[PDB]
């Protein structure tokens, strides 16, 4: 698994108030570490993980200035896009922006990205060459031509290849005891009534980190993915995660079924059954 540093920003227009709101969050891997909210009084970039608090005032001042300027540009972007699409001035719209870097095994950039969505749909994205952009429609073509004229890709390529991965490496060191710790899942299978003709087996994985995990059910060697309910992986609230996978099986046939768990905290894939 490549580590990553990622910033996720949401800009929302608020015509009834005459303004906009911009929220940004930063993550290393699955761990949030900073936030910014333009509705906050005196708004600043703020810490959200303990290990970032060792950064000095220059870091917080620079982060604040950078995210504040970005909030101002995105406030204007909401108006610009409303005009490109000839939308009413009364409606709220959403512009999301996400950029970040994944770290290769050699300490270089494995992949960088910088993209936007408007009202949930892809708008404009930096291609993996970091030299060119892909636009989703005629509006985004206007933006793309602007950004080709300005050589906006150079600003992003330089960041992604340089400071993004160097920052990431620093944060991985700062937070090594949590960020670089894999915690394996605690696992068990529960049994619940379903009907006359069925019982539910639920395979649980609790307390694991990172969030990536595989839970599958088999019956005597055959995978059951088509008939199982697999919930979205969910946060515990303490930096770990939870997941379950459930299947309705015939009454009395529980021993034919095995749950299979893969996670980077386990030494070997686990097989378990209801007991």
């Amino acid at each position: 698994g490549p580590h990553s540093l990622s910033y996720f920003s949401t800009a929302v227009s608020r015509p009834d108030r005459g303004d906009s709101r911009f929220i940004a969050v930063g993550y290393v891997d699955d761990t949030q570490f900073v936030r910014f909210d333009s509705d906050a009084p005196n708004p600043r970039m703020e810490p959200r993980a303990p290990w970032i608090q060792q950064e000095g005032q220059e870091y917080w001042d620079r982060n604040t200035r950078n995210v504040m300027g970005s909030a101002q540009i995105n406030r204007v972007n909401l108006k610009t896009l409303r005009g490109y699409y000839n939308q009413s001035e009364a409606g709220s719209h959403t512009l999301q922006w996400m950029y970040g870097c994944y770290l290769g095994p050699d300490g270089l950039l494995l992949r960088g990205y910088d993209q936007f969505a408007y009202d949930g749909a892809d708008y404009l994205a930096l291609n993996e060459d970091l030299r060119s952009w892909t636009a989703a429609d005629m509006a985004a073509q206007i933006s793309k031509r602007k950004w080709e004229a300005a050589d906006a890709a150079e600003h992003w390529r330089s960041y992604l290849q340089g400071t993004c991965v160097e920052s990431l490496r620093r944060y991985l060191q700062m937070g090594k005891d949590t960020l670089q710790r894999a915690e394996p899942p605690k696992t068990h299978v529960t049994r619940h009534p379903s009907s006359d003709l069925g019982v539910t087996l639920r395979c649980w994985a609790l307390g694991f980190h990172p969030k990536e995990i595989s839970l599958t059910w088999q019956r005597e060697g055959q995978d059951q993915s088509q008939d199982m309910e697999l919930v979205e992986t969910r946060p515990s609230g303490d930096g770990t995660f939870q997941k379950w996978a459930a299947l309705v099986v015939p009454p009395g046939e529980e021993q034919s079924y095995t749950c299979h768990v893969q996670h980077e905290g386990l030494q070997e894939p686990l097989t378990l059954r209801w007991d």
Partner: peptide, 9 residues
Amino acid sequence: DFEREGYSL
């Protein structure tokens, strides 16, 4: 370390 946007859409 947050990179500022430099350009508008």
